[PDB]
Symmetry: C4
Subunit: 128 residues, 4 copies
């Protein structure tokens, strides 16, 4: 991202700090990717403090993608990873509330656009 390079420079960095990871769901049928990423996060030795999950590329979600997204987030939470969500469109944003995803990650950790999630995470890592 140029969104990434701008916020990084605002925080005096060129590279994403070790504490922050970023993953995007690509398209509505992000299931195979969700599964892989969940597997990777489970198998690696060190985990990030914060993971931003970008939803800008998800045009809709049904019960099947909701339950997939839920299980993925549960699997990160159980390793100590704080999960932020960014970029849900207007309809997926309503679905995330109705389905309990917002509950799961916390209202304060849901961002309309990625640059505000990235800004918030870099600020939290600096305080920590």
């Amino acid at each position: 991202n140029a969104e990434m390079s701008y916020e990084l420079a605002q925080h005096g960095r060129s590279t994403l700090p070790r504490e922050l990871a970023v993953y995007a769901l690509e398209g509505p049928f992000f299931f195979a990717a969700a599964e892989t990423f969940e597997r990777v996060m489970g198998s690696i030795q060190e985990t990030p403090q914060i993971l931003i999950l970008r939803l800008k590329w998800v045009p809709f979600m049904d019960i099947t993608g909701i339950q997939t997204l839920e299980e993925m987030i549960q699997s990160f939470h159980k390793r100590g990873i704080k999960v932020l969500i960014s970029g849900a469109n207007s309809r997926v944003s309503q679905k995330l509330v109705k389905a309990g995803i917002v509950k799961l990650v916390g209202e304060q950790n849901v961002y309309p656009v990625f640059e505000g999630a990235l800004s918030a995470a870099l600020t939290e890592i600096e305080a920590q």
Copy 2:
């Protein structure tokens, strides 16, 4: 979809109801996706009432994709999911009849375009 947002508003909704899921086969070699989706539908706790399977992106199907599509639909039917099919081109449409896929899902559940499958499903969910 804008096709999705229009039919949703016609039914007074902004979001796909919990009872309906939508999956698309991407391209003729949809095998790896078929397998994942079949796995997801088997593993999740709650299943949709209706699943629309979009075939607009499938340009042809051989015996191998026919038997894959058959097994996938069998696997949904056995959990109680009603499967609609939409968007088959003119040749795949003939293949679906000759191969027994139309038999499997029911003639009344096969739609030339997605908006008519979506309209029919939302109407059936409202009656239910």
Copy 3:
């Protein structure tokens, strides 16, 4: 394909006959697809008589893709499937000879372009 629809009509068909399947390797790193397709062909009940493997999208092949392609073809041959290859570019065409892939499938079953493989297969199925 329009290449497919033209040759089909030349043979008085609208749909690929049950005896012929077509698979394309997408890109040089076709490994995950090779694996899935090999799995599908092994698990389905009925197999095609002839499988055209399209190589137009493969820009180069190293020892790793050669050994993958070899194992895949071996796995089809052992179920009774005749494998044709089409569309190798000029360099992959030389590699296929040097690596023994042409030996494996037979010189007479390697075609510079897909329409000639499709024409040959439809002709062989009609004689059979």
Copy 4:
């Protein structure tokens, strides 16, 4: 590549020699590909002498992709494969140093662009 065809002709070849393989990580979430490629390299009978890993398509890497890339390279090294890296952008280039990836493969095996990695590999294979 035309980058590949030019360097090949400079070395009097039309095809990649049996000793050299080339793999690219596509995008930042190259995990599923990393896993497949690692599996292929482990299962094939013969391995290349040199593997160029192209990073031009990776826009950033977090701890999760670093540990994935590390494990993949470890898995090649343990079969006797020398791994070159090419094409890291300016930020991933800094990350590769800070994370110990450059250590792992050797400074002399990291190239700003693919054509210089390919040139170096073809030269090393010719001396060998």
